Amino acid sequence: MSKNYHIAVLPGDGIGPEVMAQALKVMDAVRSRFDMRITTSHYDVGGIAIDNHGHPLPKATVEGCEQADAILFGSVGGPKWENLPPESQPERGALLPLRKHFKLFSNLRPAKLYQGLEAFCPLRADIAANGFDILCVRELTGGIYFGQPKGREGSGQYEKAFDTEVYHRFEIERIARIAFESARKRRRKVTSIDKANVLQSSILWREIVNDVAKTYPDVELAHMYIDNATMQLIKDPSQFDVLLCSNLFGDILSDECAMITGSMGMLPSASLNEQGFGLYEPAGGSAPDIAGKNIANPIAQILSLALLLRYSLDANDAATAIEQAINRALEEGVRTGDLARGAAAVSTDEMGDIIARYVAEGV
Amino acid sequence: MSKNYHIAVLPGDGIGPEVMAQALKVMDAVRSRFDMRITTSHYDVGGIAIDNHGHPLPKATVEGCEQADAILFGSVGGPKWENLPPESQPERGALLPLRKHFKLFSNLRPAKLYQGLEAFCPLRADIAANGFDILCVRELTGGIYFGQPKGREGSGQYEKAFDTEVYHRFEIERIARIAFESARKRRRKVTSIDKANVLQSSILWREIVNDVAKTYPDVELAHMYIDNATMQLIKDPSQFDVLLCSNLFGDILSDECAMITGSMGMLPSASLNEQGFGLYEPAGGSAPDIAGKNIANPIAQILSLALLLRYSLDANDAATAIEQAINRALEEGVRTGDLARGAAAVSTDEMGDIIARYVAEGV
Ligand SMILES: [Mn+2]
Ligand SMILES: [Mn+2]
């Protein structure tokens, strides 16, 4: 008994279409198992949109997303457009405007080292064997990415350009809550990242996070400078549970968290507004190197469909089945090339066929 | 040459006087072997200045530095002064005003994995085995840490605090030239780090660095976004030669570079103004926990003397002789207790003995 949900599917560039095809395989297994009514439409975004429409975010694409319950997004960008004005580049001219337009203030990126994939972790084996499991909560619609004033002025030696790391109380209140709520579902520890020794905006950030913390006396709260956090994710990632970050600090540390897993092809991303509409994608980029070679790990994309089902379509049931289907395959020792490091790997397609199959197979 | 160089020596707190003694011991070996006239005057700074003068940056100290060709600086801080207001504590009250007073716009932090010390690198062994050797150049007196406007205003949920990432053409050019000139003496590669897909200040930064590059056509220039650079330093640090960074981005990445060596006791730091006057110090802090115990690694301080000789006293030969002596000591299995245990390590004053003699014996 379903509502006939709708998903705008934006595959994008590079490995985007390849891994998206696998997620739609899985989505079809979810439809015809959980008897959900799911309707989709495909739209161009990024470099493909630039190719067909001259713009990375077509109005028709934004309108398609508007008409949907959530956006399942691949990846955008590539060397074929890494030559355009920033305002005209696929990565920024699409993503930043989608975030602002749909008010997706909340970015959730879970990064854990999967047991038995320690070999691929780029950290020392003893650090890797200790393990880590982190959720990076990034503020997505404010701070320096969007702050005003922002521009360039003058000429000569005093020509200048400027951006403004500005936060309002409400912006820190709402992202801080997401962090603490997420912590309750995990290991009840939040580490808020700022630069409060110098930044006025960090001093307010720290203050408002301390105020929210009073609602969560069961959660251990720590504050840590961005420059220390960058070191500690290398030195001892096991110390973090939930990372709470600004837009810019989160951009840096969330990608650092992805790198230290050694398995970015398994990492999903959710960007959420207050109404529960979201944009769900792999944590990695379009990977033009292997694009079109049926090599790419579809797991990040499929896991982001799971987040979509859980957070946007009130279907934790289908979300958890998908995650289950992915652990079984990995239990069995199924690997794409990135986690076989080449030898004995399955293709994007078979990995996607297998996961879709295990979902519909119930177990 | 002219001779009669003068250095202001500011040992500071904790391990600072300890490791400074060994830098001064090596400096006498440099005096003899290179027939250099280097006179010193010592001054209180940090905790010891608070003890003796009531505040961390006495005027006699600043004047003594003004009267010198360079500043050889130890480290400052410790638990004895942690009960003071933050702004009154040794490092905040001393290091920042000195940089500002002396317009020390450039920060150079060399980070290499020494042969023999790979075991301490926190990256996976086969990554550590590849090695790396990086100089991070960090704009030190500008950007968001000092930019205006900066403040906090308003009330309720729309109360806001803000900092401004602002750079002028003159700031960008002078720090870019330092990086190009440094790369010319290394492996002729500058990677300028920015966020030009999003920031207006980064767009100007990238534009001006491209102009400056035209003056150094014998040095390769690449650009990389800050969030990629954080990942790449973990994935493959061997790819970098010279990093050219804003204050914020260089702050973060020089600490990450320091972390990936796994041995901070080896790491020196130079902070230079446009006249070649500089403050030279270890990358690491005052290590109160081992202070006075004659175990602190003096190699950071000694290599910061080597940088003082190279950048302020026109004494590259002397600098290179100190560096060679350290390579020699390491090759003979000589280690301090941060690099080995028990009888496989030597004390601070024995390491200094060994380094000074290898310099004296070099010629
Ligand atoms: Mn990013
Ligand atoms: Mn720092």
Short mmCIF file of C-alpha atoms in Angstrom, two decimals, chain A residues 36-263:
data_model
loop_
_atom_site.label_atom_id
_atom_site.label_comp_id
_atom_site.label_asym_id
_atom_site.label_seq_id
_atom_site.Cartn_x
_atom_site.Cartn_y
_atom_site.Cartn_z
CA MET A 36 6.01 0.30 -3.15
CA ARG A 37 4.83 2.59 -5.93
CA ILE A 38 7.90 4.46 -7.12
CA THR A 39 7.91 6.58 -10.23
CA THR A 40 11.04 8.23 -11.65
CA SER A 41 12.08 10.71 -14.31
CA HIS A 42 15.59 11.25 -15.65
CA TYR A 43 17.06 14.71 -16.08
CA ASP A 44 20.35 16.08 -17.35
CA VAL A 45 22.61 17.81 -14.89
CA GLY A 46 26.23 18.87 -15.01
CA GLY A 47 28.36 18.27 -18.05
CA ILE A 48 25.77 16.28 -19.97
CA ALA A 49 23.34 19.18 -19.42
CA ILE A 50 26.01 21.64 -20.59
CA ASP A 51 26.39 19.46 -23.71
CA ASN A 52 22.67 19.29 -24.50
CA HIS A 53 21.46 22.60 -23.06
CA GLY A 54 24.42 24.98 -22.58
CA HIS A 55 23.83 25.12 -18.81
CA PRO A 56 24.71 22.67 -16.00
CA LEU A 57 21.38 23.13 -14.16
CA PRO A 58 18.48 23.36 -16.65
CA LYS A 59 15.26 24.97 -15.36
CA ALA A 60 13.47 21.84 -16.52
CA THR A 61 15.74 19.75 -14.28
CA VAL A 62 15.11 22.01 -11.22
CA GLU A 63 11.40 21.78 -12.01
CA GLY A 64 11.65 18.00 -12.23
CA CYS A 65 13.30 17.91 -8.78
CA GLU A 66 10.59 20.26 -7.47
CA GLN A 67 7.96 17.72 -8.56
CA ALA A 68 9.68 14.88 -6.70
CA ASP A 69 9.87 13.50 -3.14
CA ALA A 70 13.70 13.29 -3.33
CA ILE A 71 16.60 13.50 -5.80
CA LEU A 72 18.76 10.45 -6.56
CA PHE A 73 21.90 12.00 -7.93
CA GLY A 74 25.01 10.39 -9.49
CA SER A 75 28.00 12.64 -10.01
CA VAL A 76 28.83 15.61 -12.23
CA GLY A 77 31.93 16.91 -13.87
CA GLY A 78 34.93 16.04 -15.97
CA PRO A 79 37.95 17.34 -17.92
CA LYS A 80 35.68 18.13 -20.89
CA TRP A 81 34.30 21.09 -18.90
CA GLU A 82 37.24 21.79 -16.57
CA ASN A 83 37.87 24.87 -18.67
CA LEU A 84 34.64 26.82 -18.11
CA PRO A 85 33.99 29.85 -15.86
CA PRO A 86 33.20 28.66 -12.30
CA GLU A 87 29.66 29.93 -12.65
CA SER A 88 29.51 27.73 -15.79
CA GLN A 89 31.30 24.60 -14.41
CA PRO A 90 29.17 21.41 -13.89
CA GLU A 91 30.15 20.74 -10.29
CA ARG A 92 29.48 24.22 -8.84
CA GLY A 93 26.83 25.57 -11.21
CA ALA A 94 24.69 22.54 -10.38
CA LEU A 95 25.32 21.54 -6.77
CA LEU A 96 25.51 24.82 -4.90
CA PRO A 97 22.26 26.06 -6.54
CA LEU A 98 20.49 22.77 -5.87
CA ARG A 99 21.46 22.99 -2.19
CA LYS A 100 20.38 26.61 -1.84
CA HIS A 101 17.20 26.18 -3.87
CA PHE A 102 15.94 23.19 -1.90
CA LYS A 103 17.34 24.56 1.39
CA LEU A 104 19.31 21.35 2.02
CA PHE A 105 21.10 22.71 5.12
CA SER A 106 21.94 19.28 6.48
CA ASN A 107 24.65 17.06 4.97
CA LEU A 108 25.20 13.59 6.37
CA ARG A 109 28.20 11.53 5.34
CA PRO A 110 28.84 8.23 7.20
CA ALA A 111 32.42 6.99 6.90
CA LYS A 112 33.47 3.69 8.41
CA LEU A 113 36.25 1.25 7.74
CA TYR A 114 34.58 -2.04 6.86
CA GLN A 115 36.01 -5.02 8.75
CA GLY A 116 38.30 -6.94 6.41
CA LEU A 117 38.93 -3.98 4.03
CA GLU A 118 41.77 -2.71 6.25
CA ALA A 119 44.26 -3.39 3.42
CA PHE A 120 42.75 -0.50 1.46
CA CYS A 121 42.80 1.97 4.36
CA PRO A 122 45.72 4.36 3.59
CA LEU A 123 46.59 4.59 7.30
CA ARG A 124 49.15 2.43 9.09
CA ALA A 125 47.99 -1.16 9.62
CA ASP A 126 47.85 -0.84 13.40
CA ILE A 127 45.69 2.29 13.13
CA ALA A 128 43.52 0.53 10.52
CA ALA A 129 43.09 -2.56 12.73
CA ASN A 130 41.80 -0.27 15.53
CA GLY A 131 39.00 0.72 13.19
CA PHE A 132 36.86 3.80 12.98
CA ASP A 133 33.23 4.67 12.40
CA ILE A 134 32.33 8.31 11.92
CA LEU A 135 29.34 10.39 10.82
CA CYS A 136 30.31 13.77 9.49
CA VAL A 137 27.48 16.29 9.82
CA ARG A 138 28.13 19.26 7.56
CA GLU A 139 26.21 22.57 7.47
CA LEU A 140 25.42 22.97 3.76
CA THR A 141 23.62 26.28 3.03
CA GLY A 142 25.41 29.00 4.98
CA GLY A 143 28.82 30.35 5.95
CA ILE A 144 31.48 31.45 3.49
CA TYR A 145 30.06 29.50 0.48
CA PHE A 146 26.98 31.75 0.49
CA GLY A 147 27.82 34.71 2.73
CA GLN A 148 27.59 38.31 1.60
CA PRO A 149 29.47 40.42 0.84
CA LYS A 150 31.32 38.26 -1.68
CA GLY A 151 33.15 39.57 -4.73
CA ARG A 152 36.07 41.55 -6.07
CA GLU A 153 36.93 45.25 -6.00
CA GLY A 154 39.56 47.73 -7.24
CA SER A 155 42.77 47.46 -9.23
CA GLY A 156 46.54 47.73 -8.70
CA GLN A 157 48.32 46.52 -5.57
CA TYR A 158 45.15 47.02 -3.46
CA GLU A 159 42.85 45.10 -5.77
CA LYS A 160 41.05 42.61 -3.52
CA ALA A 161 38.57 39.75 -3.45
CA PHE A 162 36.58 38.64 -0.43
CA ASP A 163 34.11 36.08 0.96
CA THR A 164 32.25 36.23 4.30
CA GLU A 165 32.10 33.37 6.78
CA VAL A 166 28.88 34.53 8.44
CA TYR A 167 26.49 32.39 10.45
CA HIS A 168 23.18 33.35 12.06
CA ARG A 169 22.09 31.72 15.32
CA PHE A 170 19.28 29.68 13.63
CA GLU A 171 21.69 28.14 11.16
CA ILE A 172 23.93 26.79 13.93
CA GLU A 173 20.93 25.77 16.10
CA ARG A 174 19.43 23.53 13.43
CA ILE A 175 22.63 21.80 12.26
CA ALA A 176 23.75 21.30 15.88
CA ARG A 177 20.48 19.48 16.61
CA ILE A 178 21.03 17.05 13.70
CA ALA A 179 24.49 16.22 15.12
CA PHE A 180 23.21 15.55 18.66
CA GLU A 181 20.19 13.52 17.47
CA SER A 182 22.49 11.48 15.24
CA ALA A 183 24.88 10.93 18.15
CA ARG A 184 22.03 9.43 20.26
CA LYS A 185 21.55 6.81 17.57
CA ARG A 186 25.28 6.02 17.48
CA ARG A 187 27.82 6.24 20.34
CA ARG A 188 26.62 9.50 21.94
CA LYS A 189 29.68 11.60 21.18
CA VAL A 190 29.82 14.87 19.22
CA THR A 191 33.03 16.71 18.32
CA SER A 192 32.26 20.16 17.04
CA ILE A 193 34.84 21.63 14.67
CA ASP A 194 35.64 25.32 14.73
CA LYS A 195 38.49 27.83 14.82
CA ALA A 196 37.29 29.63 17.97
CA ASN A 197 40.70 30.98 18.96
CA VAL A 198 40.33 33.69 16.25
CA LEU A 199 37.10 33.48 14.26
CA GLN A 200 34.15 35.48 15.59
CA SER A 201 31.81 33.14 13.69
CA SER A 202 33.48 30.13 15.42
CA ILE A 203 33.03 31.73 18.85
CA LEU A 204 29.28 32.02 18.15
CA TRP A 205 29.29 28.50 16.67
CA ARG A 206 30.86 27.06 19.86
CA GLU A 207 28.49 29.06 22.05
CA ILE A 208 25.36 27.84 20.29
CA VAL A 209 26.57 24.26 20.20
CA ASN A 210 27.20 24.49 23.96
CA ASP A 211 23.62 25.81 24.36
CA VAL A 212 22.10 22.96 22.32
CA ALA A 213 24.25 20.50 24.30
CA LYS A 214 22.19 21.27 27.39
CA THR A 215 19.31 19.33 25.80
CA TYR A 216 21.63 16.32 25.46
CA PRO A 217 23.28 15.63 28.83
CA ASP A 218 23.80 11.97 27.73
CA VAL A 219 26.06 13.00 24.80
CA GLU A 220 29.75 13.64 25.31
CA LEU A 221 30.58 16.98 23.62
CA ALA A 222 34.09 18.01 22.59
CA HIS A 223 35.26 21.05 20.61
CA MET A 224 38.32 20.78 18.32
CA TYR A 225 40.09 23.18 15.97
CA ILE A 226 40.01 22.37 12.24
CA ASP A 227 43.85 22.17 12.12
CA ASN A 228 43.89 19.66 14.96
CA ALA A 229 41.02 17.65 13.45
CA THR A 230 42.93 17.23 10.17
CA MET A 231 45.83 15.66 12.11
CA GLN A 232 43.67 13.52 14.44
CA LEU A 233 41.72 11.82 11.64
CA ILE A 234 45.12 10.49 10.57
CA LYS A 235 46.59 9.87 14.05
CA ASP A 236 43.56 8.21 15.62
CA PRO A 237 40.21 8.19 13.78
CA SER A 238 38.74 5.86 16.42
CA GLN A 239 38.23 8.83 18.73
CA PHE A 240 35.37 10.30 16.67
CA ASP A 241 31.75 9.38 16.50
CA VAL A 242 29.83 12.40 15.15
CA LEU A 243 31.74 15.35 13.63
CA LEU A 244 29.82 18.60 13.57
CA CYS A 245 31.18 21.06 11.01
CA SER A 246 30.65 24.36 9.24
CA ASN A 247 30.12 24.38 5.46
CA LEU A 248 33.81 24.88 4.61
CA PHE A 249 35.27 22.87 7.54
CA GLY A 250 32.89 20.04 6.74
CA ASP A 251 33.87 20.10 3.06
CA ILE A 252 37.50 19.46 4.10
CA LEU A 253 37.03 16.93 6.94
CA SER A 254 34.25 14.95 5.28
CA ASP A 255 36.50 14.27 2.32
CA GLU A 256 39.33 13.45 4.72
CA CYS A 257 36.99 10.90 6.41
CA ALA A 258 36.20 9.43 3.00
CA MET A 259 39.91 9.09 2.10
CA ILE A 260 40.87 7.33 5.34
CA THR A 261 38.32 4.56 4.79
CA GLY A 262 40.20 3.55 1.66
CA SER A 263 36.81 2.61 0.18
#
